Write an enzyme that holds these catalytic residues in place. Structure first.
Site, mmCIF file in Angstrom:
data_model
loop_
_atom_site.group_PDB
_atom_site.id
_atom_site.type_symbol
_atom_site.label_atom_id
_atom_site.label_comp_id
_atom_site.label_asym_id
_atom_site.label_seq_id
_atom_site.Cartn_x
_atom_site.Cartn_y
_atom_site.Cartn_z
ATOM 1 N N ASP A 9 63.632 54.117 58.018
ATOM 2 C CA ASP A 9 62.407 54.878 58.259
ATOM 3 C C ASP A 9 61.361 54.531 57.207
ATOM 4 O O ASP A 9 61.591 54.777 56.021
ATOM 5 C CB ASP A 9 62.690 56.381 58.238
ATOM 6 C CG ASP A 9 61.572 57.194 58.872
ATOM 7 O OD1 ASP A 9 60.721 56.601 59.564
ATOM 8 O OD2 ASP A 9 61.571 58.429 58.707
ATOM 9 N N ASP A 104 57.921 52.754 63.337
ATOM 10 C CA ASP A 104 58.307 52.635 61.933
ATOM 11 C C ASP A 104 59.770 52.974 61.659
ATOM 12 O O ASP A 104 60.146 53.119 60.486
ATOM 13 C CB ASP A 104 57.391 53.506 61.060
ATOM 14 C CG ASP A 104 57.921 54.912 60.851
ATOM 15 O OD1 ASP A 104 58.456 55.514 61.801
ATOM 16 O OD2 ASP A 104 57.826 55.416 59.714
ATOM 17 N N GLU A 105 60.609 53.092 62.691
ATOM 18 C CA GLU A 105 61.982 53.507 62.458
ATOM 19 C C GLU A 105 62.881 52.990 63.574
ATOM 20 O O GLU A 105 62.420 52.705 64.683
ATOM 21 C CB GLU A 105 62.088 55.034 62.305
ATOM 22 C CG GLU A 105 62.012 55.849 63.570
ATOM 23 C CD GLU A 105 62.056 57.352 63.290
ATOM 24 O OE1 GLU A 105 61.145 57.863 62.602
ATOM 25 O OE2 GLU A 105 62.986 58.044 63.760
HETATM 26 MG MG LIG Z 1 58.206 57.392 58.471
HETATM 27 MG MG LIG Z 2 59.557 57.278 61.404
#
Ligand SMILES: [Mg+2]
Ligand SMILES: [Mg+2]
Length: 342
Positions: A9, A104-105
DNA sequence: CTAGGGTCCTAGGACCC
DNA sequence: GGGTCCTAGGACCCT
């Protein structure tokens, strides 16, 4: 038969990108979000802004009352997409078992990995280090035997840290885990659960599955399972997009159909451009429209339709306008497409 | 003082058997 | 009455 799941993350993702690309923003409070005049909200903020209480989904006027010097940025979504592609390719150096959840993860199943002597702790650390090299952004990670615990774990030592949960550690971790920390238990559910005396997974362990199923349906089964560390969901690398939408909230409520139609005429080229990237022939399963009124009720109407068509969206919006507006003002207009199944 | 990008679940009537 | 499709609404996820 115990799996190794990593959840990676990025830290303050959109903000981290803007500070990398403009070092002058590193130590002052900044946030990506729509202006107060645009009736916007905060997408995210850097740590200097969060110190003031600035949080994602906060109305921007509230962000500014908490933090008068907050610097507001509009967002460079190609820059975020670029960093997103880069970290996913970094993930692929370690496994093909990659399930992204947002830009983003991602989850990673490294159960059958050969890297770092099979250590999931060391794989997560190498990935985080590699992302900091090459992108100059930092990431956090969580390592656990199932998805949801891995995702909880990546929050606990951020920014730029990780956290490992072993099978032996699962029962102590769960005992005082607030239910609201489970992905998919939100504010409404947590409030219903609190009002019947259920705050933590330890509280839910003392509950009967049959009661949970009656009071919550399938959600009650998820609650019962998760409160025991049960999460058999497999990391799935084959998920595909199912819809695409374009909507805009106006700075002022609109009250005339001509205003709504004018809005749609600007939205439609954007929707067409985004559909075409993924479906050049514009063939789709359904299309439809969205209005949100000044009482924040929102309505959608959508229907089977073979191919993106502006006039039909105008026509449908017209009906929704006439048929369900009830004289209220309108704060948002949106267009929507459901994609064909394959 | 309340975004924009999405996924998943539920639920009633239609349609099919 | 059981599947499945159609449609609407809503909780929830991410930044
Ligand atoms: Mg994040
Ligand atoms: Mg994230």
């Amino acid at each position: 038969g115990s799996r190794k799941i990593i959840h990676v993350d990025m830290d303050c993702f959109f903000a981290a990108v803007e500070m990398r690309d403009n070092p002058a923003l590193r130590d002052i409070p900044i946030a990506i979000g729509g202006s107060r005049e645009r009736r916007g909200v905060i997408s995210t903020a850097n740590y200097p802004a969060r110190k003031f209480g600035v949080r994602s989904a906060m109305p921007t006027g509230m962000a500014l009352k908490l933090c008068p010097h907050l610097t507001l940025l509009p967002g460079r979504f190609d820059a975020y997409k670029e960093a997103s592609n880069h970290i996913r390719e970094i993930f692929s150096r370690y496994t093909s078992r990659i399930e992204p959840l947002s830009l983003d993860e991602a989850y990673l199943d490294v159960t059958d990995s050969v890297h770092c002597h099979g250590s999931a702790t060391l794989i997560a650390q190498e990935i985080r280090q590699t992302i900091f090299n090459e992108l100059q952004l930092t990431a956090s990670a969580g390592v656990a035997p199932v998805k949801f615990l891995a995702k909880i774990a990546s929050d606990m030592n951020k920014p730029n840290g990780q956290f490992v949960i072993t099978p032996a550690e699962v029962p102590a971790f769960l005992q005082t885990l607030p239910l609201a920390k489970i992905p998919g238990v939100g504010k409404v559910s947590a409030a219903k659960l609190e009002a019947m005396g259920l705050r933590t997974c330890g509280d839910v362990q003392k509950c009967d599955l049959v009661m949970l199923l009656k009071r919550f349906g399938k959600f009650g089964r998820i609650l019962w399972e998760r409160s025991q560390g049960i999460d058999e969901r497999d990391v799935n690398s084959e998920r595909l997009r199912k819809s695409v939408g374009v909507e805009r909230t106006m700075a002022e409520d609109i009250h005339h159909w001509s205003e709504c139609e004018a809005i749609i005429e600007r939205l439609y080229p954007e929707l067409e451009r985004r559909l075409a990237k993924v479906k050049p022939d514009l063939l789709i399963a359904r299309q439809g429209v969205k209005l949100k009124f000044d009482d924040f009720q929102q309505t959608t109407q959508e229907h089977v339709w073979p191919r993106l068509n502006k006039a039909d969206l105008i026509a449908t919006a017209r009906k929704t306008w006439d048929e369900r507006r009830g004289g209220r003002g309108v704060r948002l207009v949106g267009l929507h497409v459901t994609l064909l199944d394959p």
